Amino acid sequence: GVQVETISPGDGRTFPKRGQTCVVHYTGMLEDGKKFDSSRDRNKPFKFMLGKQEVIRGWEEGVAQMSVGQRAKLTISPDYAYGATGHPGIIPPHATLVFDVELLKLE
Amino acid sequence: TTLKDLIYDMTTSGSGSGLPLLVQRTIARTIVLQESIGKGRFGEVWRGKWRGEEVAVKIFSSREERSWFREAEIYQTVMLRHENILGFIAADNKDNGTWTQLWLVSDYHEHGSLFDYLNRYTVTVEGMIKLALSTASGLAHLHMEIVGTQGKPAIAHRDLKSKNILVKKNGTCCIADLGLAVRHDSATDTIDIAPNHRVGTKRYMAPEVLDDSINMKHFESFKRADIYAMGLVFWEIARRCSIGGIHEDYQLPYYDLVPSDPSVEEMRKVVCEQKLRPNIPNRWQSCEALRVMAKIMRECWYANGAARLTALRIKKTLSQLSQQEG
Numbered sequence: 086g087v088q089v090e091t092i093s094p095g096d097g098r099t100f101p102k103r104g105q106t107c108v109v110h111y112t113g114m115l116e117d118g119k120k121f122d123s124s125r126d127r128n129k130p131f132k133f134m135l136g137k138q139e140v141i142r143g144w145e146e147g148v149a150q151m152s153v154g155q156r157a158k159l160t161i162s163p164d165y166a167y168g169a170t171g172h173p174g175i176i177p178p179h180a181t182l183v184f185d186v187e188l189l190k191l192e
Numbered sequence: 193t194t195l196k197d198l199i200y201d202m203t204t205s206g207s208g209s210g211l212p213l214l215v216q217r218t219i220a221r222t223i224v225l226q227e228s229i230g231k232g233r234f235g236e237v238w239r240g241k242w243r244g245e246e247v248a249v250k251i252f253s254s255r256e257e258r259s260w261f262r263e264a265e266i267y268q269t270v271m272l273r274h275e276n277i278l279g280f281i282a283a284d285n286k287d288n289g290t291w292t293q294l295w296l297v298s299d300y301h302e303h304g305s306l307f308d309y310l311n312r313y314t315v316t317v318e319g320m321i322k323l324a325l326s327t328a329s330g331l332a333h334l335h336m337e338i339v340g341t342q343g344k345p346a347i348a349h350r351d352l353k354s355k356n357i358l359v360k361k362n363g364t365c366c367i368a369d370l371g372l373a374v375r376h377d378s379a380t381d382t383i384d385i386a387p388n389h390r391v392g393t394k395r396y397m398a399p400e401v402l403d404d405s406i407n408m409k410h411f412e413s414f415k416r417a418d419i420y421a422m423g424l425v426f427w428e429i430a431r432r433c434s435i436g437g438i439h440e441d442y443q444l445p446y447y448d449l450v451p452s453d454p455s456v457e458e459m460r461k462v463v464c465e466q467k468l469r470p471n472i473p474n475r476w477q478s479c480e481a482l483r484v485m486a487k488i489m490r491e492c493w494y495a496n497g498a499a500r501l502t503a504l505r506i507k508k509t510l511s512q513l514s515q516q517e518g
Binding site: 139172 | 201202204206208212213214215217218221222257261262264265266267268269283285
């Protein structure tokens with residue numbers, strides 16, 4: 086599934102709830118360290134509504150555990166990311182993903 | 193702002209033709225399907241809206257997972273943003289515990305394919321040149337290796353046909369369906385060829401493909417095979433050029449020499465053994481515009497791939513023609 090390792094503490098109590106929109110900054114890498122996506126490089130926060138599966142399972146469950154302001158490393162296993170298929174051209178099949186995530190705020 | 197603006201703003205050295213990985217799912221999942229547009233051999237195409245903006249969604253069926261995969265893989269690894277190439281937005285794998293569903297989101301074009309268009313309308317000399325010119329430009333853009341960051345490796349389509357060219361509202365075309373495309377990675381002299389139980393549409397297959405002689409270790413062979421097919425497309429178009437009321441009914445290449453849904457063997461008899469080509473009416477020799485088209489068709493139809501015109505050259509002679517007629 087997903088492992089969440091804190092890099093920098095959040096307020097410790099404001100966890101996203103189903104229906105809310107999470108605003109975050111991330112950087113995704115494959116296990117070997119090659120980056121494959123980064124809202125930071127875009128200088129534009131990424132937004133998604135928790136519960137509507139607009140993101141992979143490991144994210145929906147991983148970010149549901151950071152509290153606003155928190156920055157953490159989410160290590161997601163294939164069955165919680167893009168599984169056997171992977172994502173054409175970007176993510177190899179059976180890939181374990183590592184994300185650097187920061188929950189900026191909720192809306 | 194538009195989905196195209198968005199694609200531009202989120203672009204970073206390293207990004208593919210459409211939106212970034214995670215944003216792709218964000219948008220794919222937020223799209224509201226409107227109407228089934230077409231039910232092709234490889235899944236349905238739906239007109240969909242995203243925050244009001246019209247978009248196109250091709251939903252592939254289990255069997256073309258490989259076509260879905262390759263098309264998306266190509267738009268992702270090869271920077272393809274050109275006015276004559278179907279605009280890619282996002283790809284998504286929405287597998288519900290009930291049934292997997294493969295999505296391909298792209299720009300929407302109401303007219304549909306050149307095939308639907310030509311069946312619906314006859315065309316003007318000017319209209320013909322617009323269609324043909326833009327098709328050649330798109331193909332020449334695919335076949336071309338462009339150096340640099342905003343660069344791009346050469347690509348061969350492998351399934352060019354009326355049905356895989358879309359015509360925009362401005363009377364222009366853009367090439368679509370890159371599910372069988374091959375990439376030339378000159379940085380290793382290799383040809384990236386993806387696995388699929390699917391192969392080109394048989395009536396548009398070049399002679400070398402029909403008889404299996406095509407040397408698949410040489411990238412040029414693939415471009416030459418596309419040229420032969422582009423030539424048949426030009427024939428389909430010219431056949432509908434209406435001047436003073438005279439034109440033909442719409443027809444697919446070899447409609448008269450072959451059964452519908454032709455087998456490799458049947459096409460082979462006509463094209464390799466009998467060395468036949470679609471008929472070029474004598475009347476096309478009078479009117480200069482058709483005469484240039486006809487000459488291009490013939491230069492595309494030689495049995496010898498190496499004697500065929502280049503997509504760029506067709507682009508050029510077509511450009512010259514287009515300026516001699518406003």
